Amino acid sequence: MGSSHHHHHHGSGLVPRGSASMSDSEVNQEAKPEVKPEVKPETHINLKVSDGSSEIFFKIKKTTPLRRLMEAFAKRQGKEMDSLRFLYDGIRIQADQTPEDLDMEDNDIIEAHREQIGG
């Protein structure tokens, strides 16, 4: 909670109730706004290989942040998603919140499925 100089002999204190202090100043909001910059056609392309042969990449509906994935695992342990937030140098999460190294390109994720047959 905090720290302050204090000296007292062992035993019952004088009046450990009259005084008061607060250290919880955390502030958060639900359903925060998000910013997604516009890009040119086919600007973002991901390439991957799976099934021991070949894998094709396609676009997805809207954008799914890593926080979404984190939330699924968070509820597993009974942790509150809202209680956990990702901030960088006091900067609110943005579209580029993803790792700089990955540069939002060729996401390291693979899937194996052949539901659709054709060609």
Side-chain angles (χ1 to χ4, degrees):
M1 190 211 240
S3 179
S4 180
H5 180 72
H6 181 72
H7 188 277
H8 183 71
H9 290 170
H10 65 84
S12 177
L14 259 63
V15 182
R17 181 179 179 181
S19 69
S21 180
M22 300 304 294
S23 61
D24 183 358
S25 60
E26 291 174 349
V27 179
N28 69 351
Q29 297 180 42
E30 293 177 352
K32 293 180 180 180
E34 301 294 340
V35 179
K36 181 179 180 180
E38 292 176 351
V39 299
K40 293 180 178 62
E42 292 176 351
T43 297
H44 178 269
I45 298 170
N46 293 343
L47 179 61
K48 57 187 73 176
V49 179
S50 67
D51 202 11
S53 293
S54 180
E55 178 63 19
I56 186 63
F57 174 77
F58 64 94
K59 264 79 198 71
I60 59 168
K61 299 144 181 290
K62 308 299 181 181
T63 300
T64 300
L66 290 171
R67 292 190 69 191
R68 177 63 180 278
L69 288 303
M70 182 276 289
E71 181 178 0
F73 288 94
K75 66 180 180 180
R76 182 175 64 188
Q77 299 301 303
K79 295 180 180 180
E80 296 88 350
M81 181 276 289
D82 289 347
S83 70
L84 177 61
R85 298 172 296 172
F86 180 79
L87 301 177
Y88 178 78
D89 197 16
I91 300 170
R92 292 180 181 278
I93 60 172
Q94 286 179 40
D96 65 359
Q97 68 186 70
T98 68
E100 290 173 348
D101 185 354
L102 294 173
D103 197 16
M104 292 176 71
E105 182 178 0
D106 192 351
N107 193 34
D108 287 347
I109 186 64
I110 60 172
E111 279 291 271
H113 200 185
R114 296 290 183 273
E115 181 178 0
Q116 181 181 58
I117 300 170

